[PDB]
């Protein structure tokens, strides 16, 4: 509890909630990172 | 009766700087106090005995 | 370990968690499962 | 580091179950606390240690550390 | 107040370019405060220079293929991306890549003008086959941070322009982690670990350096609204607090000639401070002087590296 | 009604007031002084402690409460105390009912 | 690029709040900002507080007075809330003396020189005829929350008795970014942090303070080169 929580809200899809990118390329992980730090990235948006 | 309490919640007193910290969801924004950026979502507060 | 990408749940995570125990030692998965502890922990206090 | 320290799979792969395992270890623990006890007054059967050690190290540890590096053997009686 | 115990910072190395740097020992709290600050201070406030957009050819925005080469265009942007550059132009600067024929076009193959240097020609920007052709130019600019293609999006129309994400920052990952270190005094005195990671240009320890020396400005733009002010004194700053071991002793000698430390005893020294300072003119005017007694007090003197005429700490004596 | 309040007996005017007793003087002529209980010990090992809550200048009727209780507040039970409260899951220290 | 640093201004709403504008700062770097801005000013400024007390007759906490209309365990309770300064890094000890009836109020304290009693109106106590109250309260200089466990002296005397002991003089501080989007062909942020005192010294000065602990612990860092 509190962990599955944790977990499931990390990976989930954006059904509802306010995706933004969608169709933004990264070249790494680090790089994806600092897009979400920046308000122009969302934790569930779909990207490459 | 929740009709009461929500219509009351749009109509409190605003504090020293005019403003009503509770939406009328009644849900608050609150501030992390260790990292210092503001939660993502507003959340439930209020006073409990 | 293979990329995940599907949603997460409970099933899913109790899937994962058997299979690190049957096919890794018991050290790796102790980490593993800090690790998701941790992870679990921060990302449901910034779940909303 | 600590007491998940050597692994237990590592340990395992020096004797055939956890069962013997434990009596392997208790048996050169008890053997490397009564070499310290005895070690002042006059030389006894007893050897070891036989790996680097500490100030104050819990005398099972250091067997677990024989065991594992492999500079132990196990007959039967 | 004193804080009663200084706090350290002490570093490891990782990698070629990676490290993990551990102050301690905070006090409670303190953890929090200065781990944030740290981290967003690297990722955001030291100044780079990267490539802003990119003009493949004369025809593009086919983004299925770019003829002539195996990858797309999606590839061939995150390639250039991981480009690491530096640059001196405030104004945007041009830069061509002319490679041709088959085989593997790298980061070597650019011809950068001057004032710009690419710091990792070994990188592998695309593959030509079928003796193709790619005729590309990049701009190089400075900034800071990450900024996107949006904010770089222009409303005046090119043909070939395309931008691309901008990665300026020097530092490309960092984490931090606190946690309890104190067993002999009271615990909940904080340790703060922070893991960087930058690019092939920069070291983590000028990314620490920078960021420190800003954040030390940012609050001093603070401080200085009333500088009497009392707050927390670390007090034995380690340079000057070594050095009081050496430069400040009453003793003004330990082993030297018998006959100049009698000389200078009587003339007006007492401890080596009185004498490193002012040195030459002191020594002159005064009866007492010698012309190879120099060597006696200047290089000899160097209990642990000292010149002479330099300015003495602890100017007032303990008497 | 529980009967761990200190209540006016008869209507009257209070006459000199200490945290160690309230003498009061009746409207009939008749003086009363009421004793409260200062750090006394409950059958559990808490404590027993009275406060005053009336003036020396006021007036009292039968049945006015002059001295509060173990855990009463002006009168009226208070068994504890309000928290400004938030509802959300932190670092994990408030896990499963902490 | 930019190449203007950030630059720091005051505005004043009452004696005792102030506002502090920080611009222009990089853009997602202001909350970090005003967040170890509060933390420095709730944790770590210096200031003054009582720290014991002992009553003419009075022996232990859970006792009372003749003649007063409170415990000696609300007396403490009551003097917690009593702000005060202090020059002198020696236990400072003033008096308090009162007879007959009335309110003790906090400006019946008799402070010696050096030190203050800077809200001479809190009521301490309140006294009949019949009743005189004499204490001594000690003061000292620190930071932070101390309990009373902490102040208990080696070998004390039977009169004394420690109190909790609160080194504070910063009341509430709060702090929000505006986003200007200055017309620089760029985004940036504008801090404002909101700091509020009481009434023990001015927040320019805690400000100050909290600026100079700061730039102490970061300079460790800076000299890292």
């Known amino acids: 509890q509190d962990m599955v929580l944790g977990l499931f809200f990390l990976t989930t899809d954006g059904e509802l909630r306010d995706t933004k990118g969608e169709g933004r390329a990264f070249g790494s992980t680090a790089e994806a990172i600092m897009a979400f730090d920046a308000g122009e990235l969302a934790l569930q948006s779909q990207i490459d | 009766r929740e009709d009461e309490l929500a219509g009351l919640l749009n109509h409190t007193i605003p504090n020293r700087d005019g403003e009503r910290m509770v939406l009328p969801t009644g849900k608050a924004r609150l501030f992390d106090g260790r990292s210092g950026e503001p939660f993502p979502d507003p959340i439930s507060v209020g006073y409990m005995y | 370990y293979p990329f995940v990408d ?43 | 580091e600590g007491i998940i320290n050597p692994p237990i799979d590592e340990l395992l792969e020096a004797t055939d179950s956890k069962y013997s395992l434990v009596i392997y270890a208790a048996k050169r623990a008890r053997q490397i606390n009564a070499y310290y006890s005895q070690l002042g007054e006059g030389l006894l059967e007893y050897v070891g240690p036989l790996v680097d050690t500490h100030v104050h190290e819990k005398p099972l540890s250091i067997a677990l ?12 009686i | 107040m004193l804080i009663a115990q200084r706090p350290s910072l002490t570093e490891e190395v990782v990698d070629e370019f990676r490290s993990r740097f551990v102050i301690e020992p905070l006090e409670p709290g303190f953890g929090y405060t200065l781990g944030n600050s740290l981290r967003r201070t690297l990722l955001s406030s030291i100044p780079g220079a990267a490539v802003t957009s990119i003009r493949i050819d004369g025809v593009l925005h086919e983004f299925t293929t770019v003829p002539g080469v195996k990858e797309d265009v999606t590839d061939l942007i995150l390639n250039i991306k991981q480009l690491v550059v530096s640059s001196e132009h405030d104004e945007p600067v041009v830069m061509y890549l002319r490679k041709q024929g088959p085989g593997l076009v790298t980061a070597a193959d650019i011809a950068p003008p001057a004032g710009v240097e690419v710091h990792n020609p070994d990188l592998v920007l695309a593959t030509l086959n079928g003796k193709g052709k790619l005729e590309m130019e990049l701009t190089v600019e400075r900034g800071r941070g990450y900024v996107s293609a949006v904010q ?144 006696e007090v200047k290089a000899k003197l160097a209990g642990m590296g000292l010149a002479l005429k330099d300015s003495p700490p602890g100017f007032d004596p303990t008497a | 009604d529980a009967g761990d309040v200190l209540k006016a007996e008869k209507d009257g005017v209070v006459q000199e007031l200490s945290a160690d007793y309230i003498t009061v003087a009746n409207d009939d002529g008749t003086y009363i002084t009421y004793r409260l209980h200062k750090f006394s010990r409950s059958n559990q090992g808490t404590s027993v402690n009275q406060k005053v809550v009336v003036d020396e200048g006021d007036r009292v009727i039968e049945g006015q409460v002059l001295a509060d209780g173990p855990a009463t507040e002006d009168g009226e039970m208070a068994l504890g105390k309000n928290l400004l409260v938030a509802f959300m899951p932190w670092e994990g220290h408030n896990y499963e009912d902490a």
Not at chain 3, 9 to 34: F, H, M
Not at chain 5, 238 to 258: F, H, K, N, R
């Open chain 5, 152 to 295: 770089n999006k222009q409303v005046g129309q090119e043909i070939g322009r395309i931008p691309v994400d901008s990665i300026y920052s020097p530092v490309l990952k960092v984490t931090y982690k606190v946690e309890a270190t104190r067993v002999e005094q009271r615990t909940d005195f904080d340790k703060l670990i922070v893991d960087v990671e930058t690019k092939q240009a920069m070291r983590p320890r000028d990314a620490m350096a920078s960021a420190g020396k800003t954040l030390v400005e940012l609050f001093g733009l603070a401080r200085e609204l009333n500088i009497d002010a009392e707050g927390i004194d670390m007090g034995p700053s380690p340079t000057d607090a070594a050095l009081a071991a050496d430069l400040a002793l009453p003793i003004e000698e330990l082993e030297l000639t018998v006959r100049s430390y009698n000389c200078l005893k009587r003339e007006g020294i007492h401890s080596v401070g009185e004498l490193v300072a002012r040195s030459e003119a002191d020594l002159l005017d005064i009866r007492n002087f010698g012309a190879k007694s120099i060597d």
């Open chain 4, 65 to 76: 550390r024989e065991i594992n590096a492999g500079l132990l053997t196990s007959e039967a």
């Open chain 3, 6 to 48: 599907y949603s997460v749940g409970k099933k899913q995570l109790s899937e994962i968690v058997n299979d690190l125990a049957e096919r890794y030692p018991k050290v790796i998965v102790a980490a593993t499962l800090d690790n998701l502890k941790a992870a679990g922990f921060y990302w449901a206090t910034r779940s909303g």
